[PDB]
Nucleic acid binder design. Structure first.
Ligand SMILES: NC(=[NH2+])NCCC[C@H](N)C(=O)O
Ligand SMILES: [Mg+2]
Ligand SMILES: [Mg+2]
Ligand SMILES: [Mg+2]
Ligand SMILES: [Mg+2]
Ligand SMILES: [Mg+2]
Ligand SMILES: [Mg+2]
Ligand SMILES: [Mg+2]
Ligand SMILES: [Mg+2]
Ligand SMILES: [Mg+2]
Ligand SMILES: [Mg+2]
Ligand SMILES: [Mg+2]
Ligand SMILES: [Mg+2]
Ligand SMILES: [Mg+2]
Ligand SMILES: [Mg+2]
Ligand SMILES: [Mg+2]
Ligand SMILES: [Mg+2]
Ligand SMILES: [Mg+2]
Ligand SMILES: [Mg+2]
Ligand SMILES: [Mg+2]
Ligand SMILES: [Mg+2]
Ligand SMILES: [Mg+2]
Ligand SMILES: [Mg+2]
Ligand SMILES: [Mg+2]
Ligand SMILES: [Mg+2]
Ligand SMILES: [Mg+2]
Ligand SMILES: [Mg+2]
Ligand SMILES: [Mg+2]
Ligand SMILES: [Mg+2]
Ligand SMILES: [Mg+2]
Ligand SMILES: [Mg+2]
Ligand SMILES: [Mg+2]
Ligand SMILES: [Mg+2]
Ligand SMILES: [Mg+2]
Ligand SMILES: [Mg+2]
Ligand SMILES: [Mg+2]
Ligand SMILES: [Mg+2]
Ligand SMILES: [Mg+2]
Ligand SMILES: [Mg+2]
Ligand SMILES: [Mg+2]
Ligand SMILES: [Mg+2]
Ligand SMILES: [Mg+2]
Ligand SMILES: [Mg+2]
Ligand SMILES: [Mg+2]
Ligand SMILES: [Mg+2]
Ligand SMILES: [Mg+2]
Ligand SMILES: [Mg+2]
Ligand SMILES: [Mg+2]
Ligand SMILES: [Mg+2]
Ligand SMILES: [Mg+2]
Ligand SMILES: [Mg+2]
Ligand SMILES: [Mg+2]
Ligand SMILES: [Mg+2]
Ligand SMILES: [Mg+2]
Ligand SMILES: [Mg+2]
Ligand SMILES: [Mg+2]
Ligand SMILES: [Mg+2]
Ligand SMILES: [Mg+2]
Ligand SMILES: [Mg+2]
Ligand SMILES: [Mg+2]
Ligand SMILES: [Mg+2]
Ligand SMILES: [Mg+2]
Ligand SMILES: [Mg+2]
Ligand SMILES: [Mg+2]
Ligand SMILES: [Mg+2]
Ligand SMILES: [Mg+2]
Ligand SMILES: [Mg+2]
Ligand SMILES: [Mg+2]
Ligand SMILES: [Mg+2]
Ligand SMILES: [Mg+2]
Ligand SMILES: [Mg+2]
Ligand SMILES: [Mg+2]
Ligand SMILES: [Mg+2]
Ligand SMILES: [Mg+2]
Ligand SMILES: [Mg+2]
Ligand SMILES: [Mg+2]
Ligand SMILES: [Mg+2]
Ligand SMILES: [Mg+2]
Ligand SMILES: [Mg+2]
Ligand SMILES: [Mg+2]
Ligand SMILES: [Mg+2]
Ligand SMILES: [Mg+2]
Ligand SMILES: [Mg+2]
Ligand SMILES: [Mg+2]
Ligand SMILES: [Mg+2]
Ligand SMILES: [Mg+2]
Ligand SMILES: [Mg+2]
Ligand SMILES: [Mg+2]
Ligand SMILES: [Mg+2]
Ligand SMILES: [Mg+2]
Ligand SMILES: [Mg+2]
Ligand SMILES: [Mg+2]
Ligand SMILES: [Mg+2]
Ligand SMILES: [Mg+2]
Ligand SMILES: [Mg+2]
Ligand SMILES: [Mg+2]
Ligand SMILES: [Mg+2]
Ligand SMILES: [Mg+2]
Ligand SMILES: [Mg+2]
Ligand SMILES: [Mg+2]
Ligand SMILES: [Mg+2]
Ligand SMILES: [Mg+2]
Ligand SMILES: [Mg+2]
Ligand SMILES: [Mg+2]
Ligand SMILES: [Mg+2]
Ligand SMILES: [Mg+2]
Ligand SMILES: [Mg+2]
Ligand SMILES: [Mg+2]
Ligand SMILES: [Mg+2]
Ligand SMILES: [Mg+2]
Ligand SMILES: [Mg+2]
Ligand SMILES: [Mg+2]
Ligand SMILES: [Mg+2]
Ligand SMILES: [Mg+2]
Ligand SMILES: [Mg+2]
Ligand SMILES: [Mg+2]
Ligand SMILES: [Mg+2]
Ligand SMILES: [Mg+2]
Ligand SMILES: [Mg+2]
Ligand SMILES: [Mg+2]
Ligand SMILES: [Mg+2]
Ligand SMILES: [Mg+2]
Ligand SMILES: [Mg+2]
Ligand SMILES: [Mg+2]
Ligand SMILES: [Mg+2]
Ligand SMILES: [Mg+2]
Ligand SMILES: [Mg+2]
Ligand SMILES: [Mg+2]
Ligand SMILES: [Mg+2]
Ligand SMILES: [Mg+2]
Ligand SMILES: [Mg+2]
Ligand SMILES: [Mg+2]
Ligand SMILES: [Mg+2]
Ligand SMILES: [Mg+2]
Ligand SMILES: [Mg+2]
Ligand SMILES: [Mg+2]
Ligand SMILES: [Mg+2]
Ligand SMILES: [Mg+2]
Ligand SMILES: [Mg+2]
Ligand SMILES: [Mg+2]
Ligand SMILES: [Mg+2]
Ligand SMILES: [Mg+2]
Ligand SMILES: [Mg+2]
Ligand SMILES: [Mg+2]
Ligand SMILES: [Mg+2]
Ligand SMILES: [Mg+2]
Ligand SMILES: [Mg+2]
Ligand SMILES: [Mg+2]
Ligand SMILES: [Mg+2]
Ligand SMILES: [Mg+2]
Ligand SMILES: [Mg+2]
Ligand SMILES: [Mg+2]
Ligand SMILES: [Mg+2]
Ligand SMILES: [Mg+2]
Ligand SMILES: [Mg+2]
Ligand SMILES: [Mg+2]
Ligand SMILES: [Mg+2]
Ligand SMILES: [Mg+2]
Ligand SMILES: [Mg+2]
Ligand SMILES: [Mg+2]
Ligand SMILES: [Mg+2]
Ligand SMILES: [Mg+2]
Ligand SMILES: [Mg+2]
Ligand SMILES: [Mg+2]
Ligand SMILES: [Mg+2]
Ligand SMILES: [Mg+2]
Ligand SMILES: [Mg+2]
Ligand SMILES: [Mg+2]
Ligand SMILES: [Mg+2]
Ligand SMILES: [Mg+2]
Ligand SMILES: [Mg+2]
Ligand SMILES: [Mg+2]
Ligand SMILES: [Mg+2]
Ligand SMILES: [Mg+2]
Ligand SMILES: [Mg+2]
Ligand SMILES: [Mg+2]
Ligand SMILES: [Mg+2]
Ligand SMILES: [Mg+2]
Ligand SMILES: [Mg+2]
Ligand SMILES: [Mg+2]
Ligand SMILES: [Mg+2]
Ligand SMILES: [Mg+2]
Ligand SMILES: [Mg+2]
Ligand SMILES: [Mg+2]
Ligand SMILES: [Mg+2]
Ligand SMILES: [Mg+2]
Ligand SMILES: [Zn+2]
Lengths: 101, 116, 112, 140, 154, 59
RNA sequence: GGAUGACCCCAGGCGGUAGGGGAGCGUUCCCGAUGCCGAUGAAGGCCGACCCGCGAGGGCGGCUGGAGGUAAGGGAAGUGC
RNA sequence: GUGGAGCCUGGGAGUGAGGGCGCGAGCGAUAACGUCCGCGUCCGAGCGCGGGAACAACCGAGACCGCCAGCUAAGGCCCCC
RNA sequence: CGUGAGGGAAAGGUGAAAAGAACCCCGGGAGGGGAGUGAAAUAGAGCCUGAAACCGUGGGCUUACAAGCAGUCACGGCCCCGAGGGGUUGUGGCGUGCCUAUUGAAGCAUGAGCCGGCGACUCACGGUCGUGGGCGAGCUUAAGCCGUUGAGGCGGAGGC
């Protein structure tokens, strides 16, 4: 069984036992959360229009982090314009527990 | 009191030269050419972070198109059908289904054909 | 067990000697001797001296067998240049660099 | 999740009969086959389309007065070295080159594109020497 | 560039040498040339207002008074010039050297005995000043110095 | 003429590529049949003075 | 909101040359310092894929080095190529 | 009409070589990538982004940062694409 | 250097102590290899530290059908350190150096071979406005004098 869930304005195919980084969520580490399901597949196939009324994926919050730093660098020629920015994207790491059909 | 340069410029130049590791010739060896290369590289990375989102959408769409044509419709009919059926699986996941779950993608083609 | 010798501040241009050193790198002592004897370059005299010095060091100081010796590594480094004036036409003076070489030879033993 | 990238695949050998088909509208389909964009796992940076065998290339068709008025051109690098060969003459002398040229211009430039072009095998007359590959006959 | 030792000669012609143009070698662009806007001998003093100084003096003593760190004394018992004597007096006075002390007395003999101690700063009353007060954790004056202090802040 | 001059400094890569033809070839040497010393062919042996199987030279 | 930048919530602004304003980093030196860190290793050098910081930077670790360095908070400039 | 609106006082400027395009005229030849004014615009300073094969000023659109998510603009949807 | 008046450099550091390497070995010598000294000898006198350009030896990855402001985004291969990361780059996408000057520059307009070090908005007095304090119909001293020896005070002439 696999599900396509939606969190952080993005969609991911998840199965039980998957670890996944998503956009940060207000959930204590160790809390468990329920993600909405767009489509079920594997054994049976259920198609959301757009979301499946019963379905949910249960995920355990493993913790929150900050991604590896990206250098945002800006430069315009002949105008003495330079900008240096450090960006670290917050994230939440999830452990997918079960797909509740 | 006097405040000579001392250690300050060497340290500043070494930060730049370390970022330029791997560049060709004086672009990784000379502080001046390294910094000019880094200027371009920073603008490129910013521009290509943006451009990467488009590149991957093109690839999804091309793959989605080919999976569609195995079932006798084209991409643009398939997308319209999903819109009318209310399905909102995105192109990243449609392209993954097209390759990894051909049965599921076929049922999606079914829904799209039926919606019009 | 390695043995080495260095001739430092030899008054010859590095690029010239390196040509000769490249001839013997990785060669048995005896084959390097025959090569150096019939190399028509000034550098051969100098590489031959450093080579023989390393061989003597191997036998007399480091308990290695002469029959077992090969040129394990060898390289020429550049030393301080002697700067000299070269007068040209119309009152110009150029600087000639009479370059200088540190010649290293390292011998090891070819077991069996 | 990262996008699927295929491990290397056995290519598909394919056979197309050129007789009666319009030169340009046949070429775009061959180009698509060579790029492998009919395949759901298409990847832009590896050679993974079909091998395309074409027979009866001398029987390709063309509209208007192109037989007389379409000119192929070659530059030798020498003064006056521009050669102009009309389509008629090319068909009379190296007919397989009409389709090859039409297809090559529709493939990407660069190392991968030149590689894809080698996977196209064009033959005048009804026969090809690739039985060992057992090409699958295609209707396009 | 005017005070350096070199001549005012133009080192080479303006034009047609192929080098950058130059005048004399004392110009600050040259190694060994003059300094642009270097320090010159300078008077850093200024007349702080008298009322600010006077009122400053009172506040520095008042701050010590409010912490309980101000102690007045009538006399220094057996302090006749020797460090060991001022030490013995300080012990009973509660000054064990765990806190720095500003000792303000006109008794020259008492200043001589205390002054070598690392934790003591010694002043005659006419020298009371807020830097020295704020420098030290404790303030000790005899009643005579306490009085010339009062005359000053009035 | 008008004094040609290099337009750009030659790169380390292009300098050393031009030198890809500069390595020496070892001397051609054969053993002397009389004394087994290595020496150039078609020359009188410098170690024993023999050539064509006979003494030609004090050495 | 709470009550005075404690931090949170909602909303909106945030392309930029000449140029105006604001907040910071670092360098030399002084007070702090008759202190404190230092041969169980100062400064400087060479690394690092680690930590903090938007950034200038600051830590920490290994190697080198072998005798100096200097905090919170302030002060002054021969202060950053 | 609450807007990086307006008005008053005062501190600090920079600018006083503009340029393309549209429209209205003069000059020119109902010439000029011409020239000189007016209204507007953009570039200047948005040589950042999409389209126009490429291309400051034509069309689209005002780039705080990140995303392997979605909708559109001009322009496109035979292949290169 | 200049006939001359005159111009006018560069160049500091072994170690606590010379204990400055007897003697042997290759070499004509230079230089080195051992021995030995030293806490340390890439502190060995061409000596503290010992950056960078620049030169070389060894190793990993890579390269002889390929179009390039040299990077960047992606994926894959190999090597390395142990659902991760570092090195390398085959292919695919995108992509007109920096500075200056200009209406406008990748520009075939200026400057720069590369590296390291030196290198340009200050100071005094007066002015004007803002600002942190002191005192307020008042505010403030100057030169000096006394004290101190990194102690402050006195001094009202005068100024606003
Ligand atoms: N009574 C004194 N002023 N004592 C000061 C202590 C020592 C001071 N440096 C001096 O020269 O006197
Ligand atoms: Mg969400
Ligand atoms: Mg799993
Ligand atoms: Mg993320
Ligand atoms: Mg940068
Ligand atoms: Mg530029
Ligand atoms: Mg540019
Ligand atoms: Mg600039
Ligand atoms: Mg400009
Ligand atoms: Mg710039
Ligand atoms: Mg100093
Ligand atoms: Mg400086
Ligand atoms: Mg310095
Ligand atoms: Mg420096
Ligand atoms: Mg710098
Ligand atoms: Mg450094
Ligand atoms: Mg720095
Ligand atoms: Mg590289
Ligand atoms: Mg190079
Ligand atoms: Mg190179
Ligand atoms: Mg280098
Ligand atoms: Mg971006
Ligand atoms: Mg972009
Ligand atoms: Mg987009
Ligand atoms: Mg169809
Ligand atoms: Mg739609
Ligand atoms: Mg949709
Ligand atoms: Mg020869
Ligand atoms: Mg021997
Ligand atoms: Mg001369
Ligand atoms: Mg001359
Ligand atoms: Mg002459
Ligand atoms: Mg020379
Ligand atoms: Mg087809
Ligand atoms: Mg693509
Ligand atoms: Mg036709
Ligand atoms: Mg033929
Ligand atoms: Mg083409
Ligand atoms: Mg192209
Ligand atoms: Mg002068
Ligand atoms: Mg003078
Ligand atoms: Mg003078
Ligand atoms: Mg003089
Ligand atoms: Mg003079
Ligand atoms: Mg003069
Ligand atoms: Mg004069
Ligand atoms: Mg003069
Ligand atoms: Mg001139
Ligand atoms: Mg000249
Ligand atoms: Mg020149
Ligand atoms: Mg010059
Ligand atoms: Mg010059
Ligand atoms: Mg001149
Ligand atoms: Mg001058
Ligand atoms: Mg002068
Ligand atoms: Mg002078
Ligand atoms: Mg000088
Ligand atoms: Mg000087
Ligand atoms: Mg001097
Ligand atoms: Mg001097
Ligand atoms: Mg100066
Ligand atoms: Mg000056
Ligand atoms: Mg000056
Ligand atoms: Mg003075
Ligand atoms: Mg001042
Ligand atoms: Mg004064
Ligand atoms: Mg008064
Ligand atoms: Mg004392
Ligand atoms: Mg003292
Ligand atoms: Mg004290
Ligand atoms: Mg004192
Ligand atoms: Mg001539
Ligand atoms: Mg001529
Ligand atoms: Mg010529
Ligand atoms: Mg001539
Ligand atoms: Mg010439
Ligand atoms: Mg030239
Ligand atoms: Mg090389
Ligand atoms: Mg070359
Ligand atoms: Mg003999
Ligand atoms: Mg907010
Ligand atoms: Mg801004
Ligand atoms: Mg402000
Ligand atoms: Mg600071
Ligand atoms: Mg700070
Ligand atoms: Mg600094
Ligand atoms: Mg000082
Ligand atoms: Mg002190
Ligand atoms: Mg100290
Ligand atoms: Mg200690
Ligand atoms: Mg010790
Ligand atoms: Mg250590
Ligand atoms: Mg320091
Ligand atoms: Mg220091
Ligand atoms: Mg650091
Ligand atoms: Mg250190
Ligand atoms: Mg050590
Ligand atoms: Mg000391
Ligand atoms: Mg300090
Ligand atoms: Mg501080
Ligand atoms: Mg202070
Ligand atoms: Mg000063
Ligand atoms: Mg300066
Ligand atoms: Mg505004
Ligand atoms: Mg305004
Ligand atoms: Mg100002
Ligand atoms: Mg003005
Ligand atoms: Mg102006
Ligand atoms: Mg004017
Ligand atoms: Mg004007
Ligand atoms: Mg003009
Ligand atoms: Mg005008
Ligand atoms: Mg205007
Ligand atoms: Mg134009
Ligand atoms: Mg117009
Ligand atoms: Mg119109
Ligand atoms: Mg008009
Ligand atoms: Mg008119
Ligand atoms: Mg006409
Ligand atoms: Mg015009
Ligand atoms: Mg016109
Ligand atoms: Mg006109
Ligand atoms: Mg206009
Ligand atoms: Mg301008
Ligand atoms: Mg625009
Ligand atoms: Mg604008
Ligand atoms: Mg620009
Ligand atoms: Mg562009
Ligand atoms: Mg455009
Ligand atoms: Mg375009
Ligand atoms: Mg285009
Ligand atoms: Mg534009
Ligand atoms: Mg904006
Ligand atoms: Mg759409
Ligand atoms: Mg449209
Ligand atoms: Mg088109
Ligand atoms: Mg297409
Ligand atoms: Mg003369
Ligand atoms: Mg003379
Ligand atoms: Mg003179
Ligand atoms: Mg000197
Ligand atoms: Mg000495
Ligand atoms: Mg010493
Ligand atoms: Mg010795
Ligand atoms: Mg001897
Ligand atoms: Mg001898
Ligand atoms: Mg001998
Ligand atoms: Mg000797
Ligand atoms: Mg030796
Ligand atoms: Mg020992
Ligand atoms: Mg020890
Ligand atoms: Mg060392
Ligand atoms: Mg040392
Ligand atoms: Mg020392
Ligand atoms: Mg040293
Ligand atoms: Mg050295
Ligand atoms: Mg190598
Ligand atoms: Mg080819
Ligand atoms: Mg190849
Ligand atoms: Mg690329
Ligand atoms: Mg891709
Ligand atoms: Mg990897
Ligand atoms: Mg990679
Ligand atoms: Mg370019
Ligand atoms: Mg351009
Ligand atoms: Mg720059
Ligand atoms: Mg310039
Ligand atoms: Mg100009
Ligand atoms: Mg101009
Ligand atoms: Mg112009
Ligand atoms: Mg160019
Ligand atoms: Mg050029
Ligand atoms: Mg010119
Ligand atoms: Mg240029
Ligand atoms: Mg000019
Ligand atoms: Mg030059
Ligand atoms: Mg260089
Ligand atoms: Mg520099
Ligand atoms: Mg100023
Ligand atoms: Mg000054
Ligand atoms: Mg001033
Ligand atoms: Mg002022
Ligand atoms: Mg004021
Ligand atoms: Mg007052
Ligand atoms: Mg008041
Ligand atoms: Mg007056
Ligand atoms: Zn012989």
């Amino acid at each position: 069984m696999f599900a396509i869930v939606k969190t952080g304005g993005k969609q991911y195919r998840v199965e039980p036992g998957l670890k996944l980084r998503v956009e940060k969520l207000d959930a204590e580490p160790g809390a468990t959360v329920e993600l909405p399901v767009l489509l079920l597949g594997g054994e049976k196939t259920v198609v959301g229009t757009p979301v499946v009324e019963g379905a949910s994926v249960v995920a355990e919050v493993l913790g929150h982090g900050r991604g590896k730093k990206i250098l945002v660098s800006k430069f315009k020629a002949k105008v003495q314009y330079r900008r240096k920015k450090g960006h670290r994207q917050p994230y939440t790491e999830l452990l997918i527990k079960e797909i509740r059909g | 009191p006097r405040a000579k340069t001392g250690v300050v410029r060497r340290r500043k130049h070494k930060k730049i030269l370390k970022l330029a590791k791997g560049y060709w010739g004086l672009r990784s060896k000379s502080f001046r050419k390294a910094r000019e290369t880094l200027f371009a590289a920073g603008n490129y990375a910013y521009a290509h972070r943006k451009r990467r989102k488009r590149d991957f959408r093109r690839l999804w769409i091309v793959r989605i198109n080919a999976a569609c044509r195995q079932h006798g419709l084209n991409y643009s009919t398939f997308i319209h059908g999903l819109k009318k059926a209310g399905i909102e699986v995105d192109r990243k996941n449609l392209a993954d289904l097209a390759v990894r779950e051909p049965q599921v993608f076929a049922e999606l083609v079914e829904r799209a054909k039926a919606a019009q | 067990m390695e043995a080495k010798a260095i001739a430092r501040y030899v008054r010859i241009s590095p690029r010239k000697v390196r040509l000769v050193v490249d001839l013997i790198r990785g060669k048995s002592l005896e084959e390097a001797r025959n090569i150096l004897r019939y190399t028509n370059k000034r550098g051969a005299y100098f590489v031959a001296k450093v080579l023989e010095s390393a061989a003597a060091n191997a036998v007399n100081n480091h308990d290695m067998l002469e029959d077992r010796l090969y040129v394990k590594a060898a390289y020429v480094d550049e030393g301080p240049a002697l700067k000299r004036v070269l007068p040209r036409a119309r009152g110009r003076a150029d600087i000639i660099k009479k370059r200088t070489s540190h010649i290293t030879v390292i011998l090891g033993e070819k077991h069996g | 999740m990262k996008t699927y990238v295929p491990k290397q695949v056995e290519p598909r050998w394919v056979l197309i009969d050129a007789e009666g088909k319009t030169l340009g509208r046949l070429a775009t389909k061959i180009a698509t086959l060579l790029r492998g964009k009919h395949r759901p796992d298409w990847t832009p940076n590896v050679a993974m389309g079909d091998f395309v065998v074409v027979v009866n290339a001398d029987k390709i068709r063309v509209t208007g007065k192109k037989l007389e008025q379409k000119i192929y051109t070659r530059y030798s690098g020498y003064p006056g070295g521009l050669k102009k060969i009309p389509l008629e003459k090319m068909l009379a002398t190296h007919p397989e080159r009409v389709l090859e040229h039409a297809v090559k211009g529709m493939l990407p430039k660069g190392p991968l594109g030149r590689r894809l072009f080698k996977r196209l095998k064009v033959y005048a007359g009804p026969d090809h020497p690739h039985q060992a590959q057992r090409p699958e006959k295609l209707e396009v | 560039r005017g005070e350096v030792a070199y001549s005012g000669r133009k080192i080479w012609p303006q034009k047609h040498t192929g080098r950058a143009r130059h005048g004399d070698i004392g110009a600050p662009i040259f190694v060994g040339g003059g300094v642009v806007f270097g320090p010159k001998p300078r008077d850093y003093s200024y007349t702080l207002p008298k009322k600010v100084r006077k009122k400053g003096l009172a506040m520095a003593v008042a701050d010590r008074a409010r912490e309980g760190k101000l102690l007045l004394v009538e006399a220094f018992a057996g302090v006749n010039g020797k460090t060991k004597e001022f030490l013995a007096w300080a012990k009973e006075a509660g000054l064990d050297g765990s806190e720095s002390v500003l000792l303000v007395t006109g008794n020259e003999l008492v200043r001589r005995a205390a002054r070598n101690l690392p934790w003591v700063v010694t002043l005659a009353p006419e020298g009371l000043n807020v830097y020295d007060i704020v420098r030290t954790e404790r303030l000790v004056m005899d009643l005579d110095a306490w009085e010339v202090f009062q005359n000053r802040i009035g | 003429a008008k004094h040609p001059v290099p337009k750009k400094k030659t790169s380390k890569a292009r300098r050393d590529a031009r030198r890809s033809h500069h390595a020496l070839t070892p001397p051609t040497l054969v053993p002397c049949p009389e004394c087994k010393a290595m020496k150039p062919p078609h020359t009188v042996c410098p170690e024993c003075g023999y050539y064509a199987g006979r003494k030609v030279l004090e050495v």
